[model samples]
Target: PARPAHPLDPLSTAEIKAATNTVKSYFAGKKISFNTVTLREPARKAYIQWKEQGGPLPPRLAYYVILEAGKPGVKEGLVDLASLSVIETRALETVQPILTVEDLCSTEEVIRNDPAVIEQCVLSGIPANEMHKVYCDPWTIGYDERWGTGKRLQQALVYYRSDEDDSQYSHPLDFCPIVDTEEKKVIFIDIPNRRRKVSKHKHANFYPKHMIEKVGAMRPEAPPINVTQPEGVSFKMTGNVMEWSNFKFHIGFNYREGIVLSDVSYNDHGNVRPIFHRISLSEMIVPYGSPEFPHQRKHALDIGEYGAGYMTNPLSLGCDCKGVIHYLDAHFSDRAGDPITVKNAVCIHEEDDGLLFKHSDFRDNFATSLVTRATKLVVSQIFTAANYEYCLYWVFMQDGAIRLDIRLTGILNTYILGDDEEAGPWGTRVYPNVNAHNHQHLFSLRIDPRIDGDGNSAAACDAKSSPYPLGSPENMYGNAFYSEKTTFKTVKDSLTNYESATGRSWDIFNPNKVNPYSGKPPSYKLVSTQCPPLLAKEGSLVAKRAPWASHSVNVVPYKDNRLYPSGDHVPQWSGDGVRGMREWIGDGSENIDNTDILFFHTFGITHFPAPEDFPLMPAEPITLMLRPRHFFTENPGLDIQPSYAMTTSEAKRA
Candidate 1:
């Protein structure tokens, strides 16, 4: 049997070498020092057709190459790297690598793995012996207008990574290092000068010992429950496309967006219907609301700064995923256009969704049929963006539904408090003198749906209660809750604020196609399961930077460049040129009816840390569901039969 072809597969060794050589040759004469070179994703349209036809797409290479041209000590190196433009050429056979020459901006500087940062921290007053016990993460130094045009600097956030069994001592060291990247040296120390001492309250500081020893542990050793695939995995993998049962979809990856699912469709009876053209996490911002100086500036545009795809972990089986798993590798380029592969960047697997639907006619001779098992495709990836880790899952179900689940699991970003009585009202003290600052994890998903066809419309479906008399014509019985739908005519009106009073939901559908049963357009509704907007006060930096987080749903006319919700260039301090969702919904001039549109759905957890969150916080699983409203005439899973059934003889034998 031939090896299955996946165009989305990471670049081959030969391709990487060629691309690296190409980049070197391209800049060999420019007298520019190459810092990094990396591969980028091909155009989406070209990518879509490539999978459909099989084999390789056009030999196109997207390179994001950074070069330095100035002296290491001078700040000019930063300016030189950012101003560097892409150099595109097709000299390497048919491989035409198009180069985009935009400034690396805030996006390029990911988490710090540099040993120099630690060396600088010691110079900034940290003990040398304790240096090994410290963990440092990169924090972007926002652009300052005070510096005339070419001020580029980087800062590091140092914390204590405990080595003992009580390894939960992650308090901030109250100091930071400002580094000059080109020279790779620390220029100065940014000490907040706050006299907040490190917390000594070893909160559960010894749980790992007992856990490892299993002393008086709650270990219920039961027989392993395995998901047997005797017939082998039923899913068929072709190029980037994968099909199982009646569902078909294509999976791709990129540096900013980790797992990208495109051309999603379902086998409707005999007809293959369109679902979503593309779906991805455009941007996520974790804003820490604290009055303290450095803590106040703790606003991280995770995707914009540290690329999610770059930080994705190679998932391990029997741990990260179970059941016959298929791993897909990702290819990305660096500043020098050198291709690198992130092995097992994505894991595709089928799992049993217990109880798709179950009903029994107990009165009729106890003769009953229950359809209780469902096979759903899960394309998942875990991104460790600094201190926080996000497990992003794109769940495709047989019932014509797509669920974007975000399981947040990682250590909490905390600070040291002087006294328990002095604990800020906005945050909760997880440990004595340890203020696990209150924060919000806001994620905006760009869902470009192709329901029925490309042209679609968005509407607000609000379940409202009648105000009329109980017996009146308007309310025949006051119990009737009317589903009031307000169709969106323009982009401006698409920004929908969740109406808790009416139980509001947003639906995207094809106006041209109507459901025969309900005489309504075939639509899928976005149910915001756990959406908590930014609690930061209005006009505050956090609120102004990410205004889209205020609304549960926002529908806008699809524009190619308008992808990120917090805009492409997310500034650390202010909202400057951040053409986010708010700007996209301006004046409401663009018509959305029968046109391709983008749906922005926001959902997240407002974490107020507690004592239980220490020593590795528990996973908070939050889900956003794209439910079939009138899209399907009936339950798409109705045709599914029970995987296992009991008979009289079989039951006796068991």
Candidate 2:
């Protein structure tokens, strides 16, 4: 009923209704399903002009991806709200769109009723009559030439339940059912060369009841720690624009990317200065390292194949978070082209960050001291991709720093192993017949910096030791070292990797603006340590499907629709140089210095599952930070009030 205050706000229910209702008649005769109906963000140039220049705001547009019932490829288009009509429409021939929640949820019914699936379950040791006890996790076939985009397909990770309450992951079936998304039936069953029986162990579960039965008792009780903010919270918000600690940004969500931080700027002495124009986790790849026929088809581009926004779990205060918390709901279109909301999809909370700064005068026996407690704002969400859950937290500290922490949790994906077969170096037998394979979780972070204005560049900063001899003036003590920065010129030069030997860090700075005091470009340094290699070889399927992970750092000139690194339609699309980072970095000949650039950092951990990680895995956290470097004259957090400032005279009186 009212106009949206900002162009970056997510689609409203009314807007979603108008977008879908108009499209409903457009595809009236055909049996179609809506894969997605999300906001079509304005162009970067357009967005900036409206944000800075005295230009008119862009029109509201909705981007849609839809499929004909029982069809292979998808139809994508855009609907302009100003006219309520489709403006652009195109048919993707060999491209399969994202798997919707409806598509994933509907697979259970289709497979459970299939006679072939029931027969396979029985052969895997399930009671013949208990057909309903069979369950499967429908996963995207990462890439396989045998399938070759002939039909939309999903490989079923079959499991059997001896009891209704049993954990399905503990007993993986030997064979996988390849189901056709359109036909709703098993097209082929991949039976391992050496078939393995189901695990003989009793349900190895992590539930409280099951744990008590296995271990005999629970751990010692501890007092519940309560986090309360009685007076109030420091963060103030108007709609989705959150303002806290002199940092202000809009929290936007879509069907692909979950929570997008846009128009991010830090208030400097009441003067608003832009930092990052936008930031997001563009894509993620989890490639299993088991060298088996069917196992090679297990890599998942979670965000592109299955959307983080669609798979995002509905969270709650007591369960997902605590303290004085604020929440933002996410809205997306269902298969019926109707709007659906995930309540508490984004959690905003405040936490007591141990300490921001501390100092003591040792000359006065540490009597003169100052300690400033830190407060951080956290925006978090948890989304499960099949057997694994990703808990993501985007945190902002008082010291003008932004850090992203993603914790990997949930049960590990297990496979069946024969009693006579030993899990090779490629796998681990976590339980009797449950084999957990090696895999790596690689995530690409997209940062579009607007450091001071709109023009910014990034550089690779590495710590290097001087080559001078011990007696030389530059290295008198043989310990002289300084940070050497390599400014990126062409795209080829920006296709860099993490240099762990030199403790490499990337700096995104406004090259045109130099700090007067330090005589260096104003920048934010990316300090990260967990940079795992893409273990898959050059010509491997994992490498082909996820070229964005080829290097740790990829810088390219910013473009309008260059959001995902794995291409637009990721389901069955091969990395054959269609779109994405591979094409964006084509020839690596484009100039990128002092121009607007899109920065991507590939960082994560490689997992070699152990016995302790089985049953249910505890959360493993990966953290990366962007701290101010030469951007401020002095300590940015010096304004923060101290917890206590004790003087020598006051300490003596105490």
Candidate 3:
């Protein structure tokens, strides 16, 4: 597999994740010491009073100067200045910087002429990168409002990487601005190396001092300022046909276990939603035609006795029940019972929707493919016997929203066929694999939100419950079964009157007579029988044999840098979310200056070696650790003093 290079050299598979906990301890919570400092007031006060009120800010005006190198140079006295919003990187005519010096001479000249004055300005030549920002720090935790206030910016800065495809996954980190309530100047504090074997605190050796008075002198008393609307940011995405192995290397994986990929992708139905997902392989057995297994039950193979065989009939190994419930709960607008129970009402099933099979020999609906159709038949039969009130919402996450595009994936446990109805692959034994792709025979519930209202509309595809009025046409795929306890009055009864949680009803399918949110009758209806084999509930798949299950969930602190450890949830920046860069950088924004993107991949679940898992371990358990790039302008170990490099004055004094 290919490897990404940057902060550290790639590790062997055995040590891939050896440093996960170690590295996490190193990076996590380390920013808190600085975040705790409240310095907003001090920084702003001094900056304000010195420029406008002519009060004291500092002996010298403290300001940061950013320069784009490789451009022509000059010694003009006063330069043009503007405030361009990061999202809209355009030169503005309305807003100008308070300090614009055109020909005061570059640092090179000051150092040559005025030794004492030039001594303090660090005369380091601009680095090769485009952005060179110099700012005084109060370094408080929150306060960027362009995207949002508080932790949102912090999280966006650190957690989100606009360049996932870039070889440098983690680099050029961010320098957040935190303010002190009193001094109106940036605060510098000491912090510890949490990951070190024996760690202790250390302080920054140098800090910027402002010359606020000088900065004010360069500005006019006041200038007319106008707020102009900027254009919307645009995102362009092109994907790599990443292989399974590539995914494992980049994301980390287990051979005996499944590694999940979750993202929102839209379908023709026009609804953006999520489909419960899982990716796994069948047992070691190969498809028929192999000379070694010629006598093997072709039915036991991909082309088993059933027509389309193993490819069409995907046997689900595990369900991300926790993930499934959390996804649904987040979408539902009305709920009264415990959220977890509400989520459990539905089960997630995985099916190969025509993507898993190799059709090289079966193009003409060949006889060979027919023999393997039994695998799908048995799999579908198992789903038809699942015991939960389920809804398979085809899931996807794209752009900015998570759509609940509803489509049922498994058969409700109650809706099972009797012994007489039980059938084999292709129904006709001899042609078992012929009609292998027949989805209806697969026995799954499907609802296309596009046919109803493009996923943005109400979801009314109930097979055994009536959450809507009886005669409502809004309910598409009309297979709803009525139950004595279920109440779909608004939809089934065609009454458009029902109250909402907010007490207002807006022409929903039903208003006065139906439940406002869901013209459906009631929340649940009990099944009459309990057939364990037929029950295809997601949670039951793990039973006593498995100890844990994981799901992908989104939380707020996930996007914030201020809140470290983000409580007890998976880091939002773990996978693709942490990968993309161009997608997240708002338009017109300044390009990355000193910032660098970092990445880390870890094991999803703990495993104990089973007998079969012996012999050759597919891959050693791996973990990851990433260090924010901008944490150091230069090696911190080498330069501890702001006094190291000569400012013009220092050079002259020397």
Candidate 4:
């Protein structure tokens, strides 16, 4: 079995070649631009039968998105790969497709030559002949009421660089240009009501040359630390499946969700038990705090609109991941339907976790009774969204715990400052004339759990103290507390938010199976505290664009086309709130408990930029863990041999 043996396997290079041609031939008459070509996963139970049992594999299909030369909006097609035939075709005008990499690369040239944008640059104090100095960070126009998805668009975050290698973000223009992607022209230029000319100051560059020039000396370099795995890695890879310690799972990638983990399972003795069916970071919205017109359009649904996998970086060998790292490559189709491969798209490595467990007998005074070290398997990837980079790591521990650690590390999205105009409360003056606005990075994490099998239950778990009298039966000695678990039976019941008061956690468990020792359901508990509520007010553009982030937890019945929380067509989508997550949770009465369902949890941090955050921000981490609750009968790592152990007889002799 070389590859594509499993039904849930990702599309191969051969499939991409044929699929692109299949769609190209289907629309033979006119010119068409290939936007995306990816695998349309087989039906749910159909895939499970083939992979889990010995059933026939389902039909493989490719979903393709294209833009016709004369079309209004995007046209999507589903092609059956076996027959090389079109299964379905849809020409939608209301919703815009995601922005491709080529689309973003071409945005600067569009504005550089546009007469309207050139005028704005002159007004911003740039010379007319220095149009080459004018630059912009092409951003998705997060739902503006003026345009409202009337045209395929990108909001040009205008900036200027005095020298060839200077930082453009240090000098921002007050005007924002809206470019029609289809027409490739400037549709509108939004100039702020408050006319503030760009300041005349040195570029707040962060490179070594600039740092040395500004301060007259550069910081001394630190000694390098090396990591070595003399023997080799402790993981086995058969195709895209990874087996480390006692855990096994498939590592998948797509144009949207950068890394997708599927069919995660653990080996208990010799029995294979299913842990989670699927998990991915489905959507993200970086909403800005400034309520001004152009700034309000700054809330970017980066994953949905831009496609995380498309923006992924080709990770360096030793720079990104150290000792004994293995990489899984990713491939995509360009505008001309040519295959583009990123060699090190996903980096897999193991890190020492200090100690997993330790116990000592104090009576004997032996220091090391038993001590076990932990080695964690980490699958990571990084993506850049115009102004910032998002680093994601999906780690699996020997103690049967899964963790997602995200790091927000990149330059701040700065704006121009007037001569004496301060940023007020909306932002911080990071540099002399660079204003960095406050923003929140909201992400929707999707998880489909199958603890032991299908039809698992979930609930909100909270620690609660008994509210009885001091000497009452329920509260003896006034210090009685218990975990109050609220089992959710419907979609409405599962629509919960982050409760800091209760220190809430969610439990996904198989109702059919119970732990033999604990006499409770086999469960995996989600422990996440970095949940910041969607600060964008109700009915606003940010709210409308990403209602999925407003609520902390939402459970919906699993469906084929319901993988993405922010709907399929997120770019330039007007604030209707009908598609994607809003429509999936219909009438609020859909049964979700003990059924095939998808769990979506919203969590992230709100960044209020300070001067220290400017130039370059450090990697700030946000971690969420899915650890075994009653699922494990005892410490799962107990079976592994300890690093150091001192028996009673051996200690006495020593």
User: Which candidate's lDDT is highest?
Assistant: 2
TM-score of each: 0.83, 0.98, 0.16, 0.98
- Candidate 2 per-residue lDDT over residues 96-184, each given as its tens digit: 88998887776777778888877777777776677787888999766767887878888888887778888888888899888888778
Candidate 2 segments exceeding 4 Å error = 647-654
Give the range of the ten consecutive residues with the poorest summed lDDT in model 3: 32-41
TM-score, structure 3 vs. true: 0.16
Q: Local distance difference test, per candidate?
A: 0.66, 0.88, 0.18, 0.87
RMSD in angstroms, candidate 4? 1.5
lDDT of 2 at 350: 90
Candidate 1 lDDT by residue in tens digits, 342-455: 788899998877778766555543344454587788999998866688998999887888898889987877666666346668677766666678888988888988897668
Between candidates 1 and 4, the TM-score winner: 4
The C-alpha stretches of model 4 lying farther than 4 A from their native spots are: 1-3
Candidate 4 structure lDDT: 0.87
